[PDB]
Subunit: 116 residues, 4 copies
């Protein structure tokens, strides 16, 4: 599992469950192509987006649909989404965890990159 | 004035100076129309992006060129940029400040929405 | 002046107004001596805690009463307070701003250290 | 495992390994008593601090020794520590994860509280 996303809700102090996440990879013509997507589980984690074979070097965009998450809880949040854009695998295969922490008017995101 | 951006550097404990910021407004076609841009000052602030006349309700993207900022410091960054996408307005007068706190592998952004 | 505090509310996207802040300096005995305090303004800022004469090198604690702030809003908080402990100085003139971003189950703080 | 701590390094994009964590519980006389301690593992996690039996209702303080972590990496950080203070188990036993994200001049902490 080379790419994992984990989402937390800073208001409720809980995993952010059933959050939609879309991954795109920049194509040869500089447009975004759809790469993978999923929803976070009961633990706020999304595993199984991709495989070592499919996750080649490239520029990736992870879009987390924070607006639908807050709306489903009855809050009108500020942001439409949280987008995280980065180059992956440039020096060889790594494992990436993209974590995000959500509040209605703020978010933070952190990447944890490791070598398994 | 109606829209301000402030950027801080969590590594050095300083304002993030000379950071390029670009602002886009979403067109009916869903393309992103460039709208305003500048570089943060010595105080990490960028004022005078737009005017009350020009800053109408709509969906806006603020792109902060974090990768170039960390490269100017010799510090290796993860993200290509930090992008903040939101909906502006309605009721009553509003000023928007988009604040961002930068680290090489993490950033947070928060919207402070006030009225004079 | 040499020491300022700014507090933002990540739930409402506003300055955190009427937040009690207390500042302590560590004594040689390692007890915490109260030193300064106030409440944040409408802009979420607290200025005039101390003076250049009084703010000598040492170890300081800034305690932000987050629990009372969230209770005044009807929102259930996790933390009793947010406490920020640091060492002040040396070389050249310095101003310290302690910034805090609050959510009910999360907070961040950052120090912005500058000189006029 | 009712109390877990997880620490990340925002500069390196890695778990923060071998970070010392001290837990105290407020005693009947309002002083802090030492409750438990440990160091984070190679994955930035500290498990096995306490047990369901020992972790009773009370006010707890989790002190993360961030200054020794940055110093061991050759950085002089701003904060002496990150302290997280909270009431636990007030409505019955919960599982608490205290996460912290570290930079030299900034940190954030988030609590994730769940019901297993």
């Amino acid at each position: 599992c080379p790419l994992m996303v984990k989402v937390l809700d800073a208001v409720r102090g809980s995993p952010a469950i059933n959050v939609a996440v879309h991954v795109f990879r920049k194509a040869a013509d500089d447009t975004w192509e759809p790469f993978a997507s999923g929803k976070t589980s009961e633990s706020g984690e999304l595993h199984g987006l991709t495989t070592e074979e499919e996750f080649v070097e490239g520029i990736y965009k992870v879009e987390i649909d924070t607006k639908s998450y807050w709306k489903a809880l009855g809050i009108s949040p500020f942001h439409k989404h949280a987008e995280v854009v980065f180059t992956a695998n440039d020096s060889g295969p790594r494992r990436y965890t993209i974590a995000a922490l959500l509040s209605p008017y703020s978010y933070s995101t952190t990447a944890v990159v490791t070598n398994p």
